[PDB]
PDB file of C-alpha atoms and ligand atoms in Angstrom:
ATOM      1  CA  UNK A 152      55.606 -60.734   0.982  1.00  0.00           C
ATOM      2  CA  UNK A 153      52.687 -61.934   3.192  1.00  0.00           C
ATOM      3  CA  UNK A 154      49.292 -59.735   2.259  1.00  0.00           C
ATOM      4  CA  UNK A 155      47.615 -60.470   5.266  1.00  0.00           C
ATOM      5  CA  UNK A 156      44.985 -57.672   5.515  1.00  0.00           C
ATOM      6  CA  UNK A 157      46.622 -56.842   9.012  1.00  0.00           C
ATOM      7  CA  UNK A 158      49.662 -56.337   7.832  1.00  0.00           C
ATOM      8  CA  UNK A 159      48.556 -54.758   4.583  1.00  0.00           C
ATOM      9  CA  UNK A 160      46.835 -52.245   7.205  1.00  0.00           C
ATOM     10  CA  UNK A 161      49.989 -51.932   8.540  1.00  0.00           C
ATOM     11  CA  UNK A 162      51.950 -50.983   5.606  1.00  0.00           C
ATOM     12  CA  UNK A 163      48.966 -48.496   4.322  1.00  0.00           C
ATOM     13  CA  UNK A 164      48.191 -46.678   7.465  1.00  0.00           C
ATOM     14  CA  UNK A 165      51.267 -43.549   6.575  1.00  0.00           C
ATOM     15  CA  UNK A 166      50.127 -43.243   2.779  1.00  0.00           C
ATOM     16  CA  UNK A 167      45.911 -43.412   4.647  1.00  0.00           C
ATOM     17  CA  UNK A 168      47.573 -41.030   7.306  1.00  0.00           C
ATOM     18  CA  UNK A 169      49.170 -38.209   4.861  1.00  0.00           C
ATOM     19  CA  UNK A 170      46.224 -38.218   2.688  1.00  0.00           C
ATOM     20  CA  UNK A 171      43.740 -37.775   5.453  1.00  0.00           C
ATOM     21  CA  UNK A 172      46.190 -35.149   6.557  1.00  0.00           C
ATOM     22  CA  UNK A 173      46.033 -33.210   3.431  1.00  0.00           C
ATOM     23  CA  UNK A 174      42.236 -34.013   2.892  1.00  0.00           C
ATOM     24  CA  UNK A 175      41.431 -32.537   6.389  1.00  0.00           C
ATOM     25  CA  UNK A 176      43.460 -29.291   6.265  1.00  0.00           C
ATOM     26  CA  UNK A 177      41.986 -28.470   2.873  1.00  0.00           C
ATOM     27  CA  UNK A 178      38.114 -29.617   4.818  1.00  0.00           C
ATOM     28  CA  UNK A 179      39.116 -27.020   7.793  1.00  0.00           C
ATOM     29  CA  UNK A 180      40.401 -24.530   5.785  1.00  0.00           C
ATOM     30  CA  UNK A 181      37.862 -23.890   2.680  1.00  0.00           C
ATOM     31  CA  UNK A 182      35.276 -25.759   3.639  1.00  0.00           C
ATOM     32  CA  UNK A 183      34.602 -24.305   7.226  1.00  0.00           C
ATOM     33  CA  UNK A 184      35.980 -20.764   6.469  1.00  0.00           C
ATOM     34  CA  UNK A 185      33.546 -20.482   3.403  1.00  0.00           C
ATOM     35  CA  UNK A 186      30.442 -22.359   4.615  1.00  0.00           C
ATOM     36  CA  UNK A 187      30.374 -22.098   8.340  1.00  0.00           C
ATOM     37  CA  UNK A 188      29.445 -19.610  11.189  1.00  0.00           C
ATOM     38  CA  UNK A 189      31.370 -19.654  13.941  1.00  0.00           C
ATOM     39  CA  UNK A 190      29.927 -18.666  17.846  1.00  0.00           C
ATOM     40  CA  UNK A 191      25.585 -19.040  17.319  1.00  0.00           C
ATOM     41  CA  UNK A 192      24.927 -17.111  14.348  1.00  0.00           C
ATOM     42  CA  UNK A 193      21.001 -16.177  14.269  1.00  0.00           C
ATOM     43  CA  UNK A 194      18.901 -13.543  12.836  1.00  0.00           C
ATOM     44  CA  UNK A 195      17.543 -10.745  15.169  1.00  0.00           C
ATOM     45  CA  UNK A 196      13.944  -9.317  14.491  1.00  0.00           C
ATOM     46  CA  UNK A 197      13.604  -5.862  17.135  1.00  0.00           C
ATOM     47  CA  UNK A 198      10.701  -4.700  18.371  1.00  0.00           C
ATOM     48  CA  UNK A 199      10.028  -1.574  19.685  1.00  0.00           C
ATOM     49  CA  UNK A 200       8.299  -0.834  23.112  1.00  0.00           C
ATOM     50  CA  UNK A 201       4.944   0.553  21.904  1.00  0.00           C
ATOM     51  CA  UNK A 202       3.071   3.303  24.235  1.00  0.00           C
TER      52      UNK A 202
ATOM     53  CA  UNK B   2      -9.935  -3.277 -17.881  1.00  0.00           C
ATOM     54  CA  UNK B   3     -11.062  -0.362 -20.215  1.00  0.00           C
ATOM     55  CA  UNK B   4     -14.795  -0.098 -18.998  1.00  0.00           C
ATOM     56  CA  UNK B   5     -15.286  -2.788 -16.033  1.00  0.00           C
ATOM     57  CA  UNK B   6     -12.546  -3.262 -14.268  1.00  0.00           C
ATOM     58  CA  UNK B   7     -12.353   0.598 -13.581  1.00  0.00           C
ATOM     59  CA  UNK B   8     -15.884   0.640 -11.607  1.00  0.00           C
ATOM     60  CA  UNK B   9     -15.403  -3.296 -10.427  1.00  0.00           C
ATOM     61  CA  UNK B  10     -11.766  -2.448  -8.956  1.00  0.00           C
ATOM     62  CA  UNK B  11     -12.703  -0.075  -6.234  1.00  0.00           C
ATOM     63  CA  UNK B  12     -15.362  -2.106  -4.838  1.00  0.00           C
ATOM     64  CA  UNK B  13     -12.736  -4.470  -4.410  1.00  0.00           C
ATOM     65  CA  UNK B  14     -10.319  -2.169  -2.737  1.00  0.00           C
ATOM     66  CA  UNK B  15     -12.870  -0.936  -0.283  1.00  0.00           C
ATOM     67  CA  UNK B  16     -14.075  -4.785   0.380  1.00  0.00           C
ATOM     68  CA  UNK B  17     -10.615  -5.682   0.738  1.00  0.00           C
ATOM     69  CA  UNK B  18     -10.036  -2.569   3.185  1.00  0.00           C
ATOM     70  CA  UNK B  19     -13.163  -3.871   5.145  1.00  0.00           C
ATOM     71  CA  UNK B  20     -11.587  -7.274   5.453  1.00  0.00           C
ATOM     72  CA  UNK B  21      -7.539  -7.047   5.083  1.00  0.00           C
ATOM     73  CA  UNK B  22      -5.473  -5.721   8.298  1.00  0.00           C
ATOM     74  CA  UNK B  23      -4.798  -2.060   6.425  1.00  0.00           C
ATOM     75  CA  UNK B  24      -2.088  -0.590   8.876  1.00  0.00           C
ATOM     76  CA  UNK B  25       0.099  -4.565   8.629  1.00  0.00           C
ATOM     77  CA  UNK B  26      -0.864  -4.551   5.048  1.00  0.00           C
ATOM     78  CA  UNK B  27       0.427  -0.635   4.870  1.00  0.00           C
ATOM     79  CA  UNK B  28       3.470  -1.908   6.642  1.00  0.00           C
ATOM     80  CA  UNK B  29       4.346  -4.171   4.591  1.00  0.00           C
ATOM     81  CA  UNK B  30       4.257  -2.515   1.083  1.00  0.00           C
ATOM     82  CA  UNK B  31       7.399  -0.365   2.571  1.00  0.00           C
ATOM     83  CA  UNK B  32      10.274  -3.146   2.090  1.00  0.00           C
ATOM     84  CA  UNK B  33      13.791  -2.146   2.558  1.00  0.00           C
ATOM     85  CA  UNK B  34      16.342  -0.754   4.768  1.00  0.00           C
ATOM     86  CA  UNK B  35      17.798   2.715   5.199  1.00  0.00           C
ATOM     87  CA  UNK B  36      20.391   1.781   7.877  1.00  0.00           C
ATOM     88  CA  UNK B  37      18.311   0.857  10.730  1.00  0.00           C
ATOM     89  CA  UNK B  38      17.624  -2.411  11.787  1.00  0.00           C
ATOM     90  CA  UNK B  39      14.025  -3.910  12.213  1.00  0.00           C
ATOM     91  CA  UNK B  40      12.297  -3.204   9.109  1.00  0.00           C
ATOM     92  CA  UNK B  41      12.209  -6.259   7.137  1.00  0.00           C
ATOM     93  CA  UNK B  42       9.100  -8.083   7.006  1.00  0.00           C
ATOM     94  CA  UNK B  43      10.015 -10.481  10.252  1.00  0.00           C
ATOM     95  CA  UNK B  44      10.222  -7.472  12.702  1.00  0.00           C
ATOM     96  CA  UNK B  45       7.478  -5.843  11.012  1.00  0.00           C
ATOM     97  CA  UNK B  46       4.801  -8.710  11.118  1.00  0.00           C
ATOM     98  CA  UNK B  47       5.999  -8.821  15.078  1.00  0.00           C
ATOM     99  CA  UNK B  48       5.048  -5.213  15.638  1.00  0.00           C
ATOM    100  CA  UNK B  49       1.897  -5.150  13.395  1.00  0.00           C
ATOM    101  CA  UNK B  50       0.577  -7.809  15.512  1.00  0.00           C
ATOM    102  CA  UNK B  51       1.867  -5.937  18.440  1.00  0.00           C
ATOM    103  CA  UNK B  52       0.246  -3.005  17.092  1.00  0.00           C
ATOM    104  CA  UNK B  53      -3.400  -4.218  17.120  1.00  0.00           C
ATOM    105  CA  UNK B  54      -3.853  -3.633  20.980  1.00  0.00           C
ATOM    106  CA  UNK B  55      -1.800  -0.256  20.976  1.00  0.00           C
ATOM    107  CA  UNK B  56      -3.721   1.621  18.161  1.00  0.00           C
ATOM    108  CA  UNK B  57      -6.888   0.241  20.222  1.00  0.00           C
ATOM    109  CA  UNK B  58      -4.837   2.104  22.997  1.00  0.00           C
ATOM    110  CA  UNK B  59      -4.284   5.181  21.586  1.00  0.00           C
ATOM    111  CA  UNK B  60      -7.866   5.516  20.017  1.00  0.00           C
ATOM    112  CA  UNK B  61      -9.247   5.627  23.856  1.00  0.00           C
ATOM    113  CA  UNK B  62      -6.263   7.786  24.603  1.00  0.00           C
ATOM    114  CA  UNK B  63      -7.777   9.966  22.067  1.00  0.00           C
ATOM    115  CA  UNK B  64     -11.360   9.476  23.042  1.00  0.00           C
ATOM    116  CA  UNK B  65     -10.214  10.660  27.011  1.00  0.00           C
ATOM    117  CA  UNK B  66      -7.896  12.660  27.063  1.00  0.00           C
ATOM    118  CA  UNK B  67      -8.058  15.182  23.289  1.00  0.00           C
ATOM    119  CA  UNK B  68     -11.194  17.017  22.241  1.00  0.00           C
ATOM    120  CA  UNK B  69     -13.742  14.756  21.007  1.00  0.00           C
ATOM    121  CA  UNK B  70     -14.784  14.448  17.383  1.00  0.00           C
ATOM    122  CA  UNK B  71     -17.763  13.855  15.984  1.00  0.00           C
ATOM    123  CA  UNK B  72     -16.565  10.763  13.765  1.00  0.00           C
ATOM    124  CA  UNK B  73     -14.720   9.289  16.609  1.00  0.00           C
ATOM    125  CA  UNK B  74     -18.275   9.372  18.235  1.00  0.00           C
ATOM    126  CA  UNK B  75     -20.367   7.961  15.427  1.00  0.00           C
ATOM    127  CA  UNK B  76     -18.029   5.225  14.582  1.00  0.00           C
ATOM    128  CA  UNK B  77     -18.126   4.500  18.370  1.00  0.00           C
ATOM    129  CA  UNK B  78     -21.570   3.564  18.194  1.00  0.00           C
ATOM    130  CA  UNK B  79     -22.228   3.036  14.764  1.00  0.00           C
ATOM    131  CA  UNK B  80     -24.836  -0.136  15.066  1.00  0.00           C
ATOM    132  CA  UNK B  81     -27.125   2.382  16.883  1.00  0.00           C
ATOM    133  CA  UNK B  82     -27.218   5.268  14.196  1.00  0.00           C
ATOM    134  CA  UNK B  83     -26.235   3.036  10.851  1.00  0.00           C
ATOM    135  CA  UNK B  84     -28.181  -0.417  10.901  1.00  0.00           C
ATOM    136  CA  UNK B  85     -30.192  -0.359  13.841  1.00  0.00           C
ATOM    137  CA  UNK B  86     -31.507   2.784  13.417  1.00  0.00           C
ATOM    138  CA  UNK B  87     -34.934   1.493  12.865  1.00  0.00           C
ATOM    139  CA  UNK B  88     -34.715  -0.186  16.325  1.00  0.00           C
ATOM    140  CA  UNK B  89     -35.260   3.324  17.610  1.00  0.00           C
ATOM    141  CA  UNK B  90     -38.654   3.731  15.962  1.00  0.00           C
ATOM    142  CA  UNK B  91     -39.874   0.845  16.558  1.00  0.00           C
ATOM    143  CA  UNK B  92     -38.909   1.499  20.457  1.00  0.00           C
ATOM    144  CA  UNK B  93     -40.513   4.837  19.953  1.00  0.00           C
ATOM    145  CA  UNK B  94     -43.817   3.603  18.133  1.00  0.00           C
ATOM    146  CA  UNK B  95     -44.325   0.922  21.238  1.00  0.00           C
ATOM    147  CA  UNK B  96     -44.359   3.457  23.649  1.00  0.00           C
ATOM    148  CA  UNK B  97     -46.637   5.434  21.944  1.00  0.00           C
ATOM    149  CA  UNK B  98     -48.730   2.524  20.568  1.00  0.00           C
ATOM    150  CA  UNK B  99     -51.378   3.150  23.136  1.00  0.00           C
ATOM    151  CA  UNK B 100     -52.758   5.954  21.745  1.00  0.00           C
ATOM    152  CA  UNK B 101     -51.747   5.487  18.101  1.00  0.00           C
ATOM    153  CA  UNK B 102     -54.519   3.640  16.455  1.00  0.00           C
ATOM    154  CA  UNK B 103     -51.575   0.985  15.163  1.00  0.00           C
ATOM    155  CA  UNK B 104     -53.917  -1.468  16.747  1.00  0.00           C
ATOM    156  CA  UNK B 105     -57.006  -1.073  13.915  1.00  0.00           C
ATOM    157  CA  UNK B 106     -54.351  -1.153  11.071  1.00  0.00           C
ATOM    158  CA  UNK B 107     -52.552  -4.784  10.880  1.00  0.00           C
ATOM    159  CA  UNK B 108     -50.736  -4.696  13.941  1.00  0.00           C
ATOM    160  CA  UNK B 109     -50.896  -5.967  17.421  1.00  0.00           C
ATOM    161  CA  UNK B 110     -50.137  -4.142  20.939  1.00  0.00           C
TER     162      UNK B 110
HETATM  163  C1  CDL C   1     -19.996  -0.540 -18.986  1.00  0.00           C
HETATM  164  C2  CDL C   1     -20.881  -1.774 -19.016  1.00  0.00           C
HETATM  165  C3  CDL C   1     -20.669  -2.668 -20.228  1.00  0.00           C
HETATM  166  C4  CDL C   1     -19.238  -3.168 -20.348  1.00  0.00           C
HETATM  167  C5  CDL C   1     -19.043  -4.168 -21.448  1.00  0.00           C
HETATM  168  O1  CDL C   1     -19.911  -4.567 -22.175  1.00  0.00           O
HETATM  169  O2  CDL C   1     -17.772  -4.567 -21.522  1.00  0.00           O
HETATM  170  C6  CDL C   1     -17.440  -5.512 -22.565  1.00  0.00           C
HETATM  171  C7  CDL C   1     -15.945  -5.656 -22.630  1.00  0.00           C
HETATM  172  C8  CDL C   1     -15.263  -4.343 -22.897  1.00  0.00           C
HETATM  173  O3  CDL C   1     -13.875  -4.582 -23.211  1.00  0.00           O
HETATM  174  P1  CDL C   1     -12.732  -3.863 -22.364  1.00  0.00           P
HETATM  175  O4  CDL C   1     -13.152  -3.768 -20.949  1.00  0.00           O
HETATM  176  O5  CDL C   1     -12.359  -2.631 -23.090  1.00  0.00           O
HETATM  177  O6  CDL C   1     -11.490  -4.853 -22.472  1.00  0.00           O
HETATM  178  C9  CDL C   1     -10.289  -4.391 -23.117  1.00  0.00           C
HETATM  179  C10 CDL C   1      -9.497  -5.580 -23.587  1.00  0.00           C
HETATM  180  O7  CDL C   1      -8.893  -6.212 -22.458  1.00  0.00           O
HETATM  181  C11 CDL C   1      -8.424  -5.171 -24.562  1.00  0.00           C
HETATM  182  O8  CDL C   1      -9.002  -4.289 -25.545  1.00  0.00           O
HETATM  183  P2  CDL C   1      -9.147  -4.767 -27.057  1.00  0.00           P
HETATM  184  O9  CDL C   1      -8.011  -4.243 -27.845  1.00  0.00           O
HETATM  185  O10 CDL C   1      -9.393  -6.223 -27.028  1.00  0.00           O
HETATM  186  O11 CDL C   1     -10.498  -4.084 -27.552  1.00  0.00           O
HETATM  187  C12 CDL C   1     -11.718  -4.852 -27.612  1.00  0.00           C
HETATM  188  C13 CDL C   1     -12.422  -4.538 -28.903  1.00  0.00           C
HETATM  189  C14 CDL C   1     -11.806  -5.255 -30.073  1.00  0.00           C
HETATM  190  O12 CDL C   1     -12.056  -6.672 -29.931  1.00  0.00           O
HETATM  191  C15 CDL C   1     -11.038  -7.500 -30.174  1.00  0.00           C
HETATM  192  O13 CDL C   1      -9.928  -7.131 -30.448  1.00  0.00           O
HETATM  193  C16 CDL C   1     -11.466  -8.933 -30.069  1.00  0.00           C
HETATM  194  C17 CDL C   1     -12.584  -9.147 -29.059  1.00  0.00           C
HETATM  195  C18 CDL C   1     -13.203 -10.533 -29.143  1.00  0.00           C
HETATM  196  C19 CDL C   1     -12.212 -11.673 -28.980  1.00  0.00           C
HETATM  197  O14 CDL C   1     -13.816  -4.964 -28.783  1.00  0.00           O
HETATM  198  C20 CDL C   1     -14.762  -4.024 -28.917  1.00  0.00           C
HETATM  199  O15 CDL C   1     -14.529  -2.870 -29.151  1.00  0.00           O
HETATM  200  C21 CDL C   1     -16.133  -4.602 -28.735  1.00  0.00           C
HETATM  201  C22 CDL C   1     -16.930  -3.902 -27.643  1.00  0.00           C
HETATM  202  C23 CDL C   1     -18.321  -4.487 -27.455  1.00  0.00           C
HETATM  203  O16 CDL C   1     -15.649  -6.540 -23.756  1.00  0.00           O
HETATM  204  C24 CDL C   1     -14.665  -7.434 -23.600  1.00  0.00           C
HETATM  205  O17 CDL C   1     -14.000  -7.530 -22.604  1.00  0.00           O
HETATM  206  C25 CDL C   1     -14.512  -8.291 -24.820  1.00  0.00           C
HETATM  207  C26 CDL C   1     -14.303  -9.759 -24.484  1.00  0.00           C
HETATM  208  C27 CDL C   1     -15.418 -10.340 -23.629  1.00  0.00           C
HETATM  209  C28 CDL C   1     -15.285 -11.834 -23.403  1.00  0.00           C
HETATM  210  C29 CDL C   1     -14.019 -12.237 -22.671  1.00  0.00           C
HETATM  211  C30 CDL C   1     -13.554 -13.647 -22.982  1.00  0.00           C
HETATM  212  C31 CDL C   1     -13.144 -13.846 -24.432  1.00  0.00           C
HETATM  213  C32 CDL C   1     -12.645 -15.244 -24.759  1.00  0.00           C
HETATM  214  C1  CDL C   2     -23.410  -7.501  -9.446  1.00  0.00           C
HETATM  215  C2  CDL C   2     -23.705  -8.950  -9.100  1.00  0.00           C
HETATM  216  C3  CDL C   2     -22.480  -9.848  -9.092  1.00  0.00           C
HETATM  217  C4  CDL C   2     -22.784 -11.304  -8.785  1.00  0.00           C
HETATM  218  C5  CDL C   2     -23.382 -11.539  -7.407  1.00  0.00           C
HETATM  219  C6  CDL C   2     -22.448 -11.205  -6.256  1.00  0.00           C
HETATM  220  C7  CDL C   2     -21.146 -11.983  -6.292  1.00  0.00           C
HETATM  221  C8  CDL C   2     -21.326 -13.491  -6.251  1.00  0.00           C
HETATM  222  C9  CDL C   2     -20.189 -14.244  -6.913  1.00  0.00           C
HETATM  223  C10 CDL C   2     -20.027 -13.899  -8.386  1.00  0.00           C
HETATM  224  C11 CDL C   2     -18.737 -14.383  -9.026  1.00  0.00           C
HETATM  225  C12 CDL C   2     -17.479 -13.844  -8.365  1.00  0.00           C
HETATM  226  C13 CDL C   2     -16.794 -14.828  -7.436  1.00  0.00           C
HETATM  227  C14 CDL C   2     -16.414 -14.244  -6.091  1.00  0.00           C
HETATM  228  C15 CDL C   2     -15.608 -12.965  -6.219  1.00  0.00           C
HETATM  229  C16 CDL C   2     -15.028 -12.508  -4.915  1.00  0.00           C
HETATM  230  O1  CDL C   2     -15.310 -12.957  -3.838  1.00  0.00           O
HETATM  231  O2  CDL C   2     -14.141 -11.534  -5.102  1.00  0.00           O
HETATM  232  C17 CDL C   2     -13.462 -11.024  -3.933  1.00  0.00           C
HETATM  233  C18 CDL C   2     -13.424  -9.529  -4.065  1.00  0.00           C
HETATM  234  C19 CDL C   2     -12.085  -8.981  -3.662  1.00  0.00           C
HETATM  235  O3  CDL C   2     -11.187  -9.279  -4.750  1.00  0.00           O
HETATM  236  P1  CDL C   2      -9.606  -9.308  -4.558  1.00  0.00           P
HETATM  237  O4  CDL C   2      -9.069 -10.561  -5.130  1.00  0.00           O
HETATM  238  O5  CDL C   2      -9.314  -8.975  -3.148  1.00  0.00           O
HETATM  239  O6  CDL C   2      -9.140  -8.078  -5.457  1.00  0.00           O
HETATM  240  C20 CDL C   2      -7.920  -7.377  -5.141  1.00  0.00           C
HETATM  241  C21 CDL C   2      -7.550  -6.491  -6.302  1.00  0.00           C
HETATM  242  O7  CDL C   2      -8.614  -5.570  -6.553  1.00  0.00           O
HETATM  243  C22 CDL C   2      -7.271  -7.287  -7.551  1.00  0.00           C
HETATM  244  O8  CDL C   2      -6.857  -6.382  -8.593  1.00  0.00           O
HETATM  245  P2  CDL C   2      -6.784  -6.893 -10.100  1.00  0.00           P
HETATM  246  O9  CDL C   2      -6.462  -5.747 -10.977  1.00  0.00           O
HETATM  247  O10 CDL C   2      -5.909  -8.085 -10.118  1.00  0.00           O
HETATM  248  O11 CDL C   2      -8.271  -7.389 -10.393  1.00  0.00           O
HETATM  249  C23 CDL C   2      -9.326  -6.422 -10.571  1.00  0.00           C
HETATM  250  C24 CDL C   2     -10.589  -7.140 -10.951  1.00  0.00           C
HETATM  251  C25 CDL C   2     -10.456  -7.866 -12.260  1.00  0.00           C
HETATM  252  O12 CDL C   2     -11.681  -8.609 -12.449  1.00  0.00           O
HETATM  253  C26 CDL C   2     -12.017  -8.936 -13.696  1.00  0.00           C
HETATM  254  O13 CDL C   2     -11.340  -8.687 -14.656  1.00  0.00           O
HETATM  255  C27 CDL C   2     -13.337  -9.647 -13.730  1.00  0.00           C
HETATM  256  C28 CDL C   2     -14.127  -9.410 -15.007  1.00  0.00           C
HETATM  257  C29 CDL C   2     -14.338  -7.942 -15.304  1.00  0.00           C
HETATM  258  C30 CDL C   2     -15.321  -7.667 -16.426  1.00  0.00           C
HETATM  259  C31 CDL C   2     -15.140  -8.519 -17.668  1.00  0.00           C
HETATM  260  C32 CDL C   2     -15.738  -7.887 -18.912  1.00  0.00           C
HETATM  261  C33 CDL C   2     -16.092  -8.863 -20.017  1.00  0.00           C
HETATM  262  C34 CDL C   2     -17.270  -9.754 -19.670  1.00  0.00           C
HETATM  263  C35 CDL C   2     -18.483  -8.988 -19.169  1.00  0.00           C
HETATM  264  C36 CDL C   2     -19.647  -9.870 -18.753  1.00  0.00           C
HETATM  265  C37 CDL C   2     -20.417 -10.483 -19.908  1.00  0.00           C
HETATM  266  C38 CDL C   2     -21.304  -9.496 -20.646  1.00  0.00           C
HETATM  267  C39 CDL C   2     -22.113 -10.106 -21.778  1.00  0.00           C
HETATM  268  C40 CDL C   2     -23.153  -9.165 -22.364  1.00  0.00           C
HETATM  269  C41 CDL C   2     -22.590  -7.840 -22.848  1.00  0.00           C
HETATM  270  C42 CDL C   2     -23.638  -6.890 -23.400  1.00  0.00           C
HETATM  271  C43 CDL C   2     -24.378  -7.454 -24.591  1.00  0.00           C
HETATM  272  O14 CDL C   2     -10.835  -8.175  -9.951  1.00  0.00           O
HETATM  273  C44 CDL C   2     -11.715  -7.904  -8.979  1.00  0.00           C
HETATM  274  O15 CDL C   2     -12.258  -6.842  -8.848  1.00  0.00           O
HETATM  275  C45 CDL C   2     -11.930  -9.093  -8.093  1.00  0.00           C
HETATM  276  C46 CDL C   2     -13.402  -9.382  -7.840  1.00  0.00           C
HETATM  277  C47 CDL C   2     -13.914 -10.608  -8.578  1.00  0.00           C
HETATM  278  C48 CDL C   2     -13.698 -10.582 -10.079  1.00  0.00           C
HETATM  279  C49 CDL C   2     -14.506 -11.618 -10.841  1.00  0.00           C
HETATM  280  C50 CDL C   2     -14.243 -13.061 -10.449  1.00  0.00           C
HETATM  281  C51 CDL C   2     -15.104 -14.047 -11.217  1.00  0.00           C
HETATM  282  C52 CDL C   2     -14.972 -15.502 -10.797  1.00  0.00           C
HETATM  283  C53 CDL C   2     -13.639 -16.145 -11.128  1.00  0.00           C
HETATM  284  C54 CDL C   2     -13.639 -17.658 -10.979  1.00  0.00           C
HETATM  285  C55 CDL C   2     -14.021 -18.147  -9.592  1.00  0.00           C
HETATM  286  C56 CDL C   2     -13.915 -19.651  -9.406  1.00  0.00           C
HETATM  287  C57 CDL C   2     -12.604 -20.232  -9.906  1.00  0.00           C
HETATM  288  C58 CDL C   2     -12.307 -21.643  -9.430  1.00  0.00           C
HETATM  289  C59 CDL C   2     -11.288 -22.369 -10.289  1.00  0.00           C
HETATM  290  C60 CDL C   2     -10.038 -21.563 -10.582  1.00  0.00           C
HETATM  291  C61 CDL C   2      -9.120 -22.234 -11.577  1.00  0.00           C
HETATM  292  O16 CDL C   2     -14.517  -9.019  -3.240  1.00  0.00           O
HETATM  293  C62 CDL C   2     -15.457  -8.277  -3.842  1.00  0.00           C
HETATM  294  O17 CDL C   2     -15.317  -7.764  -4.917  1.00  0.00           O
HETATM  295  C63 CDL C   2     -16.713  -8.235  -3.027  1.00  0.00           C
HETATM  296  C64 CDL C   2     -17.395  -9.595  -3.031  1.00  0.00           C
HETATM  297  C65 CDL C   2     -18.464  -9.764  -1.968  1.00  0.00           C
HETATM  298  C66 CDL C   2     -19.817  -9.171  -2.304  1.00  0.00           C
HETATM  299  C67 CDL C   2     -20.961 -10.047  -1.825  1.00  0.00           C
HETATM  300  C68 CDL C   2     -20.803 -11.491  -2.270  1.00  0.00           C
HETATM  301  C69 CDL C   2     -22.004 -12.380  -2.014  1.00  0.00           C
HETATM  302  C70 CDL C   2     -21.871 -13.764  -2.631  1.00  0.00           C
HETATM  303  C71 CDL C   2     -23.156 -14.577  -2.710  1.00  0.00           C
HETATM  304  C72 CDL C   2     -24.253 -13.972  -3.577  1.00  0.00           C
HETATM  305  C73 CDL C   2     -25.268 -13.122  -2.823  1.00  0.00           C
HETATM  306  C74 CDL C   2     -26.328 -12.479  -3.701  1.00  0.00           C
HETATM  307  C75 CDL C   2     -25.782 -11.469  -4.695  1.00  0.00           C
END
């Protein structure tokens, strides 16, 4: 078996793809649902209309 | 704290009264919520300083339109009756200095 890194790249790209799989659905799922604010969270100060 | 501090203090307060904003600072020593929004310290600072030109407002509101009162007055014009107060005599001693005999005692006309 020929390691050429190309090939090697090859052969490693479904075990690279299923782990990036897993790491990214866990990323989405607790990382953004637990850290993240979803459509322009701010804080809002009111003021009322003085005389 | 037992025999200074109890006469030093309230100079303090009342210097600090003369110099601190008292209706922000009096707005500010109220923090918390009781289910209405706008009364944490952002949207209270906004209104304080809002509030500067609107009590200034509503002071000449009262002055016009309610029944006048004598502090309202004095404070009004409080360098003529407090500090320059002596202005007036000396106004009043120059217009009579012609007949006064201030001009053979130390003084000029
Ligand atoms: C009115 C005009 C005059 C006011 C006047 O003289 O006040 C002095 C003033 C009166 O004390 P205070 O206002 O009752 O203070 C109460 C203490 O905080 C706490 O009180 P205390 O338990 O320390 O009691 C002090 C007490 C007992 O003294 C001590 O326990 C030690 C004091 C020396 C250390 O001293 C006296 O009774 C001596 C009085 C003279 O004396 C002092 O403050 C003592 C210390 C002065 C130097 C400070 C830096 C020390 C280092
Ligand atoms: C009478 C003549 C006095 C001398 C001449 C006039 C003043 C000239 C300057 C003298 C030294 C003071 C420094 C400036 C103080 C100042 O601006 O305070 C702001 C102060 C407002 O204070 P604050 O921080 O807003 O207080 C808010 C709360 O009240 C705070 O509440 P609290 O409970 O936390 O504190 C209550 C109380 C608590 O105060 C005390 O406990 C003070 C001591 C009380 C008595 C202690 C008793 C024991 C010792 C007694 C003396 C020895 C007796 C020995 C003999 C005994 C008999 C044998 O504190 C106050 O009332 C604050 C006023 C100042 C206290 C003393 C500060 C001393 C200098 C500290 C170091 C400065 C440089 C540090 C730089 C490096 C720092 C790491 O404003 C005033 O009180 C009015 C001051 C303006 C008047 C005119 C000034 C003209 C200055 C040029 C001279 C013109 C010719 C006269």
């Amino acid at each position: 078996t020929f390691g050429e890194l190309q090939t090697a790249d090859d052969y490693l790209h479904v075990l690279q793809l299923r782990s990036q799989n897993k790491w990214v659905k866990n990323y989405w799922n607790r990382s953004l649902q637990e850290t993240g604010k979803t459509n322009k969270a701010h804080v809002i100060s009111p003021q009322e209309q003085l005389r | 704290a037992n025999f200074v501090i109890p006469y030093l203090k309230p100079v303090a307060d009342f210097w600090n009264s003369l110099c601190i904003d008292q209706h922000q600072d009096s707005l500010f020593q109220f923090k918390g919520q009781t289910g209405s929004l706008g009364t944490d310290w952002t949207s209270k600072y906004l209104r304080s300083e809002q509030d500067v030109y609107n009590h200034k407002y509503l002071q000449y509101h009262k002055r016009v339109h309610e029944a006048p009162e004598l502090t309202d007055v004095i404070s009004d014009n409080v360098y003529r009756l407090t500090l320059f107060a002596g202005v007036e005599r000396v106004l009043s001693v120059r217009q009579a200095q012609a007949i006064l005999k201030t001009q053979f005692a130390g003084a000029t006309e």
